[PDB]
Design a protein around this ligand. Structure first.
Ligand SMILES: *C(=O)[C@]1([C@@H](O)[C@@H]2C=CCCC2)NC(=O)[C@H](CCO)[C@]1(C)O
Ligand SMILES: *C(=O)[C@]1([C@@H](O)[C@@H]2C=CCCC2)NC(=O)[C@H](CCO)[C@]1(C)O
Ligand SMILES: *C(=O)[C@]1([C@@H](O)[C@@H]2C=CCCC2)NC(=O)[C@H](CCO)[C@]1(C)O
Ligand SMILES: *C(=O)[C@]1([C@@H](O)[C@@H]2C=CCCC2)NC(=O)[C@H](CCO)[C@]1(C)O
Lengths: 204, 198, 222, 233, 196, 212, 222, 196, 198
């Protein structure tokens, strides 16, 4: 019935000292039936990352759409798109389907290549932008994530520290959600490098 | 719904699909082949709404055959599945959506590896070692999760399916009248005419 | 048509220590988007060292707590002033709730105390009488925001020994009443930040072999 | 289960250092028709309690009868009926609360929102609310229906927490309430300009004021407003 | 809402309450339900505030373009443009409009356009939820060819009764006088009309 | 929920998961789904927690009263019918329960009765109840033999709940095991699925699709 | 949401709270409800956030283009006309409830627009769930001929009534002052009466606490 | 339906239209909505004809047994018996009743029992669908202590307006005069009240 | 619904009833005996609502056994069927009716003739050579109308049923897991343990 509770899944992004992290679970189910434990919800265009929760088919479609748009952008602008600009592109793309929206909960994360300033943002299915300075949550366990984040989070964490925090937030929220879990992946992002780590969690 | 099963072993993809076609109170046919060859090395099985099912399959088949002729080339299984996903993803937001679920089994001659794709009517695609649509997964996935191995031979795959079908024939309320099984490998697509007692 | 039920918000939390137990709850009572009171006690001392809270539809919560206290009173009258053990109260509450199985008390109830060995004890109930003894349980509006936290910080879930390659679980050393209170307070200030029904004040009731003590802390009023 | 026919709107109240004040307008609406204008919705019980009622008026009249009976009954074989054994505001409230919850539980409610204001025998102020669902609560200020949204915010600016009660005088309190009644007359389409107000002070006793009116209203600026956007005249 | 338009010896007067409600809440207590669509052609609005504004705005636009080409429009022509909009879009509109104008040849005129989009020319007209309560009063007290003072009085008393019984009516009473002399804006506060 | 019970040479194996969910919310991972009616009788719980917990405990009270009255152990047939008949009186009221009544009497030997709130009462050798039942049946049907050893039987049950806990979003937490002999039932521990999964994967080679 | 508009002797001021909700959960504790249509015409929005933002930017874009085309400063009545005709067309499906204010060559203006397309004019206005708490304050303290400072105070106090008394409102107070002869001044977080107290404990985890299965570097450079 | 009761100097007068409808059809055009429950205690009936008759019949029965034991009942006591029936059975009744009686100590009295079963004592009362149209008129023209002639006139004019606008009201206007002098029955035909 | 069939041959009545018991998505049992012996020469088969089915059967069984003891006599098949019809006819107008359909096969020792009674949940009773409940009649009655003869032997009756069951197994959508067959004659009630391949 609710397009956002069919496939399940979660995404969470956090800002730290000169870095940002975006994490997600790997589950894809059909209500109670688990179907895939390798459905990643994070994608990237250049140095900009996008995680999408919600109806899987729309998650896939949106990624293909943004890949398409960011490619043409690079060809014309002759530079990779930035976090702030991409966020605007996401918002306007979603609102364009105001009365027949994609059932997703997007999350943007990245570092501005020119200002080095960390950036994260969330959106509702029709484009409303939420530009938090701390964290952003999305998915079937978003209430749980809000609980984890509001407590665990603190400003200016170093990459190695933010990793522990973002992971504990994700992992413990997913274990209180029937439709989340079955694997997890965390992205630690810095101006120069990006590390991707798969976590070990329950498989039930 | 009908039984649609698929398993990807070492060097091939196997699709098993129920043969019954029930309309209301009666089983109208017990030899229905719920499959369409999209290209020499790609096979698609399907289940869903009465007329949409075949209309969709044949529509996809027509498009792939046209591409093959135009380019004198056979699209990779991954390319074919993406084309199919997009068609379904369009359909889901149209006036009257195609209520069809599919399994796409293909052998990629360039990578020399078999591939199995599961896509539901919403355009939800995922690649797997084995998959199914409807309630089929509910009875068989525990068996597949147990006995599945990436290095299985085609013969081992057929034995595992046979086991799955037996579980289905024991616990499922409906009589689906057995299944037709097809293998997809480096040499093409062939049908196992002997599964009625393999 | 007439709806016999309502929702007064609120969130309550019960944590069982090794030889103590706490039952906390915000003091905000609401109706839709209006605050009925910034201070309306929701956790009660029911005698025999038992604290109880029935969260959800306040009229139902009051009726239940009131019926239970009266149950303790008659237990004394009928069994030579015998003390009602926490496990016995729990079973009794199950029958109180199940008595209205077809017109339920729309509440999530939790009681706290010490079992017969002096150990900390918490019991959480179904609106219809299903119950379990538990280590800790959040109930009400922000329950989904608090439980994950507690799984992590009280039962050390998903936490391993640094260097063990997640091969060695972090040891379950048990918390003191002071450490528990900290978790309770952080749980509520956090819930107060993200849930519009949580706020105004936090009242905790601590149970030890010495009886029942009370602590109070303010919460944001927005 | 039923549906209210003739209804009374808001009932606002608050407590100050020496007692409590409560008020309610004199209207009995019939849907959008402001049908009856001499309706008293403040019901004094003895001389230490006033029960303010909103909602269905036929039920209110029924609660009135219940209240008169409580008084009669309490007097029976009671030589201290006008002393140590007189009705306390808390007794009156627990009674009504009991009835309200029993009636909702039988799926046949008294369609009302009630506030009981009074002073206990030991001088303590008493202010508690109970409605058709049997729900009850206390607060330094209490208002029903419409006044919950517009009166509480004002009254709370005077008494925001418990420590503010001893710092509030009858004058300040009565002032706040009278102002709230005016605001309610400005924005509540089911309000009346006339109203009754009662004070229960632990020293001056019960003071019941009838036939009050909203005065000092600001409407002059209305003359400067024309059109709904671009119109100039 | 309580609105009315009354023709008299020297022309016509429009009157209205100033209340707009969203349920029991008074969203606006100083609303101006008297709208100008031309120098001496105004209307009284009831029903949907959004609908009546959009209608009025379009009528004003039409009469402006009319004037530019054919000179000043007759009150009848204005009522016709209103009608066209209300009738042709009856399924999507909730608008009860009273059109009133002053012509030199025709003097004052009143046309009432009720819900269905039909038009009715009358010596005077009342509309809005509050009008139901003053049908008897108005029918007993209205007289043709009254003076400006009498007419202002008739309207003031009528509307005060409407505001009195109707919870949907209230605030101040606004009036617009339309005569050869020009356009006059009148307003009456509660303290005055409540004790009539 | 996933609960199962099966009859074999060594008596009866009873295995259940321990997850409780209300929608997508995981209310608990440590719920008891087996009721110890008494030292010789076990009951499983699926569907409504309150309904099962309440009536199965009440069942124990009725069984005890029987033994005091007849100075003889109650039969599984009779204990199951008491619950069955009670539930039938409420048919249509909304009770929700999928249950297995398990016992081992001298007169009957290992016995399992499936009893649901529809009033159905079925004697059988293998039963699985809950949103995860189909998963457990797959494992159970292909490895069950009457001549299984108590050690192997216990594992089959544990493994079957594991299969379900893995695929069923509504199943998981831990596995609680029981062995029922004529002299009573023997509890066989609480096994966290988190740990149990990785262990079984490595030692068995199954769940090849999951990356560990 | 609580948004208000207040006219003063030489201009107009608008204010709003900063809470954004998804049901009973606070999605954003510091969103910005004050939008710019043009340099000196600002808007406060309530209702559907994506809508107030989208509608504000659309008309803003056209207003800019109109200004360039006419070589004139944008007028508030123009933004009002374009907004209402747009909202009317969508029959309320675009959930935008706005308080539009600003100064232009003809003076200072204050208006309100509802989702269905109707507009209102007044000296003081408020919209949102906090609307009633705010209006109660305005009806109690407004007076004609307010000074700039008095207006800011009145408006600011109105939002507070909402933050404290409405569950739909909270966090901070944003303000924007538009005076007839000066630049419009946007005061983001003019008030921040809801700062979170220091947490009782630090949840910083010892590195290595999280079990990792696989690790790899992600390629960003093309 | 249009019914009203008015107290005046010498007692009280009850008035009513005589129309009962079943949809658009007038089932009875000479209906008597003025019912006697005691020598000098009558009532005006509106709402369900079946419900109000059953109620009145039971009230009459009660007041007869009351009289047999405790002598003549007060108008207040009669209104209380009506109330008890209307309030206690609010879920199954549709009855708007005006109770009016003449006491020597109390003179004329009027109690209106609206739908929910609440009671309201008033100098005069109006009810029935037709009453909505005469709220303004009645409120402007009612005066306390009027003479029998004035009161008959007030009622006659009020009801003629009610009948005028209300399709549910019509026929003749019936009145019942209750004073120390006794009980008087008045009737007014269309040709008379229509041209007032 | 379940398969409930009955045929009355020369000297006996034969009842065939499906063995499956399906609850939702799964077949919980495939050896269910949907029958109750009411007396030494009277058998009753039943199908319908989950719990009502057995509760009704056992209730009737209890009553007949009680009558047998009180009178030291066995009621005629006709008498037993009228008692059962009345019970159902009462139930249909009660708070919660028994949704149970039955076939009553009995051998009347006084008349020395087998009898088959069909009664639905409304208390609609009819006596027939052969009958069924649910959809069973739809697939089998054309076969019975064709091959039925009043002088058939028990062996001929079993062959005709076998044919009916085969038609059911071919055209019916659900897998009822075969049937249990019982013969009722002058010597009592016995079960044909060999029909899984007769
Ligand atoms: C009167 O008809 C009406 C007014 O709010 C509008 C306001 C401005 C111009 C048209 C008339 N319409 C309604 O819908 C209101 C009542 C809503 O319950 C009211 C006051 O009757
Ligand atoms: C399993 O049946 C069930 C469990 O929550 C209860 C819990 C305790 C004892 C009985 C089984 N029941 C439900 O209703 C759940 C699913 C709701 O969609 C769950 C987890 O399957
Ligand atoms: C206020 O209107 C509102 C806010 O969340 C949005 C946020 C940003 C700009 C527009 C206003 N909107 C709602 O829908 C909420 C209330 C739902 O009952 C809230 C918090 O009042
Ligand atoms: C007036 O209320 C009413 C009358 O028909 C009855 C007749 C006799 C005594 C009670 C009043 N009641 C109705 O329901 C009628 C209208 C039906 O459409 C009418 C005329 O209003």
């Amino acid at each position: 019935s609710d397009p956002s509770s069919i496939n399940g899944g979660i995404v969470v992004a956090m800002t730290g000292k000169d870095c940002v992290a975006i994490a997600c679970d790997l589950r894809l189910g059909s209500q109670s039936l688990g179907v895939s434990n390798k459905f990643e919800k994070i994608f990237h265009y250049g140095h900009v990352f996008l995680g999408i929760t919600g109806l899987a088919t729309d998650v896939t479609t949106l990624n293909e759409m943004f890949r398409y748009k960011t490619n043409l952008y690079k060809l014309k602008e002759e530079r990779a798109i930035e976090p702030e600009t991409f966020t605007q592109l996401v918002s306007s793309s979603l609102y364009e389907r105001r009365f027949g929206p994609y059932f997703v909960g997007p999350v943007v994360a990245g570092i501005n290549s020119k200002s080095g300033k960390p950036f994260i943002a969330g959106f509702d299915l029709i484009g409303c932008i939420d530009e938090a300075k701390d964290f952003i949550v999305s998915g079937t366990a978003s209430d749980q994530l809000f609980g984890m984040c509001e407590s665990l989070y603190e400003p200016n964490l170093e990459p190695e520290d933010l990793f522990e925090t973002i992971s504990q937030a994700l992992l413990n929220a997913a274990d209180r959600d029937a439709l989340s879990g079955w694997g997890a992946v965390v992205y630690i992002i810095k101006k120069d490098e990006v590390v991707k780590r798969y976590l070990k969690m329950r498989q039930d | 719904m009908d039984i649609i099963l698929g398993i990807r072993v070492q060097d091939s993809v196997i699709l098993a699909s129920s043969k019954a076609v029930t309309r209301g109170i009666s089983v109208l046919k017990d030899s229905d082949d719920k499959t369409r060859q999209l290209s020499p090395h790609t096979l698609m099985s399907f289940a869903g709404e009465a007329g949409d099912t075949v209309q969709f399959a044949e529509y996809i088949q027509a498009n792939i055959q046209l591409y093959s002729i135009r380019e004198d080339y056979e699209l990779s299984p991954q390319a074919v599945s993406s084309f199919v996903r997009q068609e379904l993803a369009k359909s889901i937001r149209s006036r009257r959506p195609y209520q069809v679920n599919v399994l796409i089994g293909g052998y990629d001659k360039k990578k020399n590896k078999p591939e199995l794709y599961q896509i539901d009517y919403l355009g939800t695609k995922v690649e797997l070692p084995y998959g199914a649509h409807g309630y089929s997964g509910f009875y068989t996935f525990s068996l597949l999760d147990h006995h599945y191995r990436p290095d299985m031979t085609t013969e081992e795959g057929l034995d595992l399916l046979k086991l799955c079908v037996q579980e289905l024939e024991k616990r499922m309320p409906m009589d689906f009248k057995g299944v037709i099984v097809k293998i997809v490998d480096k040499d093409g697509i062939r049908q196992v005419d002997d599964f009625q007692a393999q | 048509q007439f709806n016999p039920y309502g929702d007064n918000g609120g969130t309550i939390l019960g944590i069982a220590g090794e030889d103590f137990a706490v039952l906390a709850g915000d003091t905000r009572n609401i109706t839709d988007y209006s605050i009925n009171s910034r201070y309306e006690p929701k956790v009660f001392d029911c005698g025999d060292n038992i604290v109880m809270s029935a969260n959800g539809f306040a009229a139902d919560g009051d009726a239940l707590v009131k019926r239970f206290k009266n149950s303790v009173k008659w237990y004394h009258f009928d069994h030579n002033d015998k003390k009602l053990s926490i496990n016995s109260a729990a079973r009794n509450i199950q029958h109180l709730l199940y008595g209205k199985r077809f017109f339920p008390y729309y509440v999530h109830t939790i009681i706290a105390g010490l079992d017969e060995d002096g150990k900390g004890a918490v019991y959480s109930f179904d609106p219809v009488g299903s119950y379990e003894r538990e280590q800790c349980r959040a109930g009400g509006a922000a329950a989904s925001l608090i439980m994950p936290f507690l799984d992590n910080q009280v039962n050390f879930k998903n936490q391993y020994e640094p260097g063990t390659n997640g091969k060695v679980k972090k040891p379950l050393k048990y918390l003191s009443v002071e450490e528990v209170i900290k978790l309770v307070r952080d749980s509520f200030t956090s819930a107060t930040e993200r849930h519009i029904q949580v706020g105004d004040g936090l009242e905790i009731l601590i149970v030890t072999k010495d009886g029942v003590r009370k602590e109070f802390y303010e919460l944001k009023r927005d | 289960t039923q549906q209210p026919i003739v209804t009374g709107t808001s009932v606002i109240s608050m407590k100050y250092d020496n007692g409590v004040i409560i008020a309610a307008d004199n209207l009995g609406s019939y849907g959008s028709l402001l049908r009856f204008n001499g309706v008293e919705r403040l019901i004094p019980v003895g001389d230490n309690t006033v029960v303010g009622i909103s909602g269905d008026i036929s039920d209110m009249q029924h609660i009135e009868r219940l209240l008169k009976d409580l008084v009669t009954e309490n007097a029976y074989d009671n030589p201290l009926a006008d002393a140590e054994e007189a009705l306390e505001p808390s007794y009156i409230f627990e009674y009504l609360a009991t009835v309200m919850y029993q009636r909702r539980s039988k799926m046949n409610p008294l369609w009302n929102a009630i506030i009981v204001a009074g002073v206990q025998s030991n001088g303590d102020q008493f202010l508690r609310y109970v409605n058709l669902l049997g729900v009850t609560y206390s607060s330094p200020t209490l208002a029903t229906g419409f006044g919950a949204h517009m009166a509480n915010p004002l009254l709370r600016k005077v008494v925001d927490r418990e420590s503010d009660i001893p710092k509030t005088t009858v004058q300040v309190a009565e002032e706040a309430i009278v102002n709230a009644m005016r605001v309610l007359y400005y924005r509540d389409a089911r309000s009346s300009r006339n109203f009754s107000l009662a004070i229960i002070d632990k020293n001056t006793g019960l003071t019941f004021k009838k036939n009050l009116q909203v005065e000092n209203m600001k409407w002059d600026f209305a003359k400067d407003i024309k059109g709904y956007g671009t119109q100039k005249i | 809402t309580s609105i009315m338009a009354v023709t008299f010896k020297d022309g016509v007067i429009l009157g209205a309450d100033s209340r707009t409600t969203t349920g029991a809440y008074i969203a606006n207590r100083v609303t101006d339900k008297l709208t100008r669509v031309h120098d001496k052609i105004w209307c009284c609005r009831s029903g949907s505030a959004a609908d009546t504004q959009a209608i009025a705005d379009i009528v004003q636009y039409h009469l402006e373009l009319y004037t530019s080409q054919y000179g000043t429009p007759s009150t009848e022509t204005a009522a016709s443009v209103f009608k066209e909009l209300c009738y042709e879009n009856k399924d999507n509109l909730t608008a009860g409009i009273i059109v009133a104008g002053y012509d030199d040849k025709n003097k004052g005129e009143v046309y009432t356009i009720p819900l269905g989009g039909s038009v009715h020319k009358l010596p005077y007209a009342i509309a809005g939820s509050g009008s139901t309560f003053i049908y008897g009063y108005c029918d007993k007290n209205f007289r043709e060819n009254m003076s400006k003072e009498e007419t202002v009085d008739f309207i003031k008393h009528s509307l005060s009764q409407a505001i009195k019984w109707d919870g949907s009516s209230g605030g101040v009473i606004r009036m617009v006088v339309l005569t050869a002399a020009g356009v006059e804006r009148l307003i009456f506060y509660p303290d005055e009309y409540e004790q009539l | 929920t996933t609960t199962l019970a099966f009859r074999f040479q060594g008596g009866i194996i009873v295995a259940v998961d321990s997850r409780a969910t209300a929608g997508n919310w995981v209310a608990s991972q440590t719920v008891k789904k087996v009721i110890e009616i008494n030292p010789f009788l076990l009951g499983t719980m699926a569907g409504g927690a309150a309904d099962c917990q309440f009536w199965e405990t009440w069942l124990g009270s009725q069984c005890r009263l029987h033994e005091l009255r007849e100075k003889e152990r109650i039969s599984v047939a009779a204990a199951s019918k008491i619950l069955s008949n009670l539930v039938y009186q409420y048919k249509g009221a909304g009770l929700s329960m999928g249950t297995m009544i398990c016992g081992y009497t001298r007169k009957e030997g290992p016995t399992i009765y499936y009893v649901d709130s529809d009033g159905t009462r079925l004697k059988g050798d293998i039963f699985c109840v809950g949103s995860g039942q189909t998963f457990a049946y797959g494992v159970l049907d292909s490895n069950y033999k009457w001549d299984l050893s108590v050690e192997d039987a216990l594992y089959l049950g544990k493994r079957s709940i594991l299969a379900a806990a893995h695929r069923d979003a509504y199943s998981g937490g831990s596995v609680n095991l029981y062995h029922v002999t004529e002299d009573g039932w023997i509890y066989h521990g609480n096994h966290d699925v988190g740990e149990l999964f990785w262990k079984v994967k490595e030692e068995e080679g199954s769940f090849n699709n999951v990356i560990g | 949401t609580t948004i208000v508009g207040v006219k003063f002797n030489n201009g107009v001021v608008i204010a709003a709270d900063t809470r954004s909700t998804q049901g009973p959960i606070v999605a954003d504790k510091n969103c910005a409800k004050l939008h710019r249509i043009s340099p000196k015409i600002w808007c406060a929005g309530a209702g559907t956030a994506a809508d107030t933002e989208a509608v504000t930017q659309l008309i803003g874009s056209n207003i800019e283009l109109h200004s360039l085309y006419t070589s004139r400063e944008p007028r508030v009545v123009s933004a009002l006309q374009m907004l209402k005709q747009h909202l009317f067309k969508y029959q309320g499906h675009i959930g935008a409830y706005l308080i539009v204010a600003g100064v232009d060559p003809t003076g200072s203006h204050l208006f309100s627009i509802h989702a269905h397309g109707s507009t209102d004019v007044g000296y003081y206005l408020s919209l949102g769930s906090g609307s009633l708490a705010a209006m109660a304050v305005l009806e109690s303290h407004w007076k004609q001929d307010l000074t700039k400072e008095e207006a800011i105070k009145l408006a600011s106090d109105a939002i507070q009534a909402g933050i404290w008394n409405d569950l739909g409102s909270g966090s901070n107070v944003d303000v924007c002052v538009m005076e007839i002869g000066k630049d419009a001044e946007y005061l983001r977080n003019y008030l921040t009466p809801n700062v979170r107290e220091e947490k009782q404990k630090s949840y910083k985890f010892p590195r290595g606490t999280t079990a990792v299965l696989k690790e790899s570097i992600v390629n960003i450079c093309d």
